[PDB]
Design an enzyme around this catalytic site. Structure first.
Site, PDB file in Angstrom:
ATOM      1  CD  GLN A  22       0.099  -9.767  -0.841  1.00  0.00           C
ATOM      2  OE1 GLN A  22      -0.506 -10.655  -0.015  1.00  0.00           O
ATOM      3  NE2 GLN A  22      -0.358  -9.606  -1.957  1.00  0.00           N
ATOM      4  CB  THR A  25       0.162   4.798  -7.559  1.00  0.00           C
ATOM      5  OG1 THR A  25      -1.081   3.912  -6.979  1.00  0.00           O
ATOM      6  CG2 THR A  25      -0.790   6.054  -8.029  1.00  0.00           C
ATOM      7  CG  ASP A  80       5.152  -2.596  -9.311  1.00  0.00           C
ATOM      8  OD1 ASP A  80       5.403  -2.231  -8.092  1.00  0.00           O
ATOM      9  OD2 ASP A  80       3.968  -2.201  -9.545  1.00  0.00           O
ATOM     10  NE  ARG A 115      -5.753  -2.396  -1.454  1.00  0.00           N
ATOM     11  CZ  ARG A 115      -6.228  -3.524  -0.652  1.00  0.00           C
ATOM     12  NH1 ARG A 115      -7.433  -3.664  -0.701  1.00  0.00           N
ATOM     13  NH2 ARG A 115      -5.291  -4.072   0.081  1.00  0.00           N
ATOM     14  CD  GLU A 175      -2.605  -1.914   0.205  1.00  0.00           C
ATOM     15  OE1 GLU A 175      -3.173  -0.947  -0.512  1.00  0.00           O
ATOM     16  OE2 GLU A 175      -2.731  -2.977   0.326  1.00  0.00           O
TER      17      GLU A 175
END
Ligand SMILES: Nc1nc2c(ncn2[C@@H]2O[C@H](COP(=O)(O)OP(=O)(O)NP(=O)(O)O)[C@@H](O)[C@H]2O)c(=O)[nH]1
Ligand SMILES: [Mg+2]
Length: 316
Positions: free
Chosen positions: A173, A17, A169, A147, A12
């Protein structure tokens, strides 16, 4: 001419993004067909957000402001299946609107650090009339606000300042961290992302672990890794927009009990920057290039990336 960039950071933090921004800034943005592909993601994110708030109301024992909302909540589940398939009826939109406007639902929304909720919940919920229109097509900002947790390795290519960038990327998590090592070869620069607004939140995988402390551990590991001695370390202190709003009402002492500064953006932001930069065990021989960002803001990312690029051109 070749530049390999690796995005790292906890879940997160905004890694994906930043990747989307490269398309908007360096390519021509998302096409109509590509935007339409995100329509089901926007709808899924929206329904999951309102459902998460309603679920929390039960756990925290919060009643609806108006009793009539109980039947709307019932109808939410009967109709929720469609959104997930890319369809949003006026009926479902109305149910979601009335629920979102309810005082009890709002009270629960304002206690979101007590459960897990998407940062883009308010963004989509406040813009329901628009996204629910028949023939709705996601805007560039709607795409940026989506998301989906990253699994596997995403590779993106683009040309900037006569350099061919190869951006990698990965998921942040806990379950995906074992995969970071597959990307360790030939890294020109690492862009380590941190969600500034995570200081008062806990990990989804563990409600006993402060998200920012987790981020610090990861940064300490990466920054000090001898393997990365010759790799540029760029630190993006992200979600600066959310941090600015949150600092006004949630004590930074939740994360750093020793913080003595005021609840202002400038002082608090600089304190966090120093906490991360101090983890560098070789301050005289290794430099960290820190930038404060709002990953969803294209102009902010454009200028910050232009700046980062010069550092790369000059150093690597
Ligand atoms: N308001 C705001 N939202 C942001 C910002 N950066 C990212 N987001 C939102 O935060 C959510 C998560 O971002 P994302 O890029 O998916 O995070 P990630 O680091 O890739 N997560 P993972 O490691 O699980 O793949 C998305 O809804 C995205 O739109 C920011 O600076 N401000
Ligand atoms: Mg991701």
């Amino acid at each position: 001419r070749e530049v390999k960039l690796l995005l790292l950071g906890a879940g997160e933090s905004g890694k994906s993004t930043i990747v989307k921004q490269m398309k908007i800034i360096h390519e021509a943005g998302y096409s109509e067909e590509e935007c339409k592909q995100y329509k089901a993601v926007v709808y899924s994110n929206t329904i999951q957000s309102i459902i998460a708030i309603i679920r929390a109301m039960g756990r925290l024992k919060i009643d609806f402001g108006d009793a009539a909302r109980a039947d709307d909540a019932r109808q939410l589940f009967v109709l929720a299946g469609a959104a997930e398939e890319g369809f949003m009826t006026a009926e479902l939109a109305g149910v979601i609107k009335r629920l979102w406007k309810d005082s009890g639902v709002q009270a629960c929304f304002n206690r979101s650090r007590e459960y897990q909720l998407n940062d883009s919940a308010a963004y989509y919920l406040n813009d329901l009339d628009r996204i629910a229109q028949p023939n709705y097509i996601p805007t560039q900002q709607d795409v940026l606000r989506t998301r989906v947790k990253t699994t596997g390795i995403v590779e993106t290519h683009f040309t900037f300042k006569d350099l061919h960038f190869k951006m990698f990327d990965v998921g942040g998590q806990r379950s995906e961290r074992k995969k970071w090592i597959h990307c360790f070869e030939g890294v020109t620069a690492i862009i380590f992302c941190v969600a500034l607004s995570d200081y008062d939140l806990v990990l989804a995988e563990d409600e006993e672990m402060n998200r920012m402390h987790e981020s610090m551990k990861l940064f300490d590991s990466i920054c000090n890794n001898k393997w990365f001695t010759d790799t540029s370390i760029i630190l993006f202190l992200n979600k600066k927009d959310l941090f600015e709003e949150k600092i006004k009402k949630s004590p930074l002492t939740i994360c750093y009990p020793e913080y003595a500064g005021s609840n202002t953006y400038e002082e608090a932001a600089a304190y966090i920057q120093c906490q991360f930069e101090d983890l560098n065990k070789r301050k005289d021989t290794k430099e960290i290039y820190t930038h404060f960002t709002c990953a969803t803001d294209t102009k902010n990312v454009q200028f910050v990336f232009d700046a980062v690029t010069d550092v790369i051109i000059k150093n690597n």
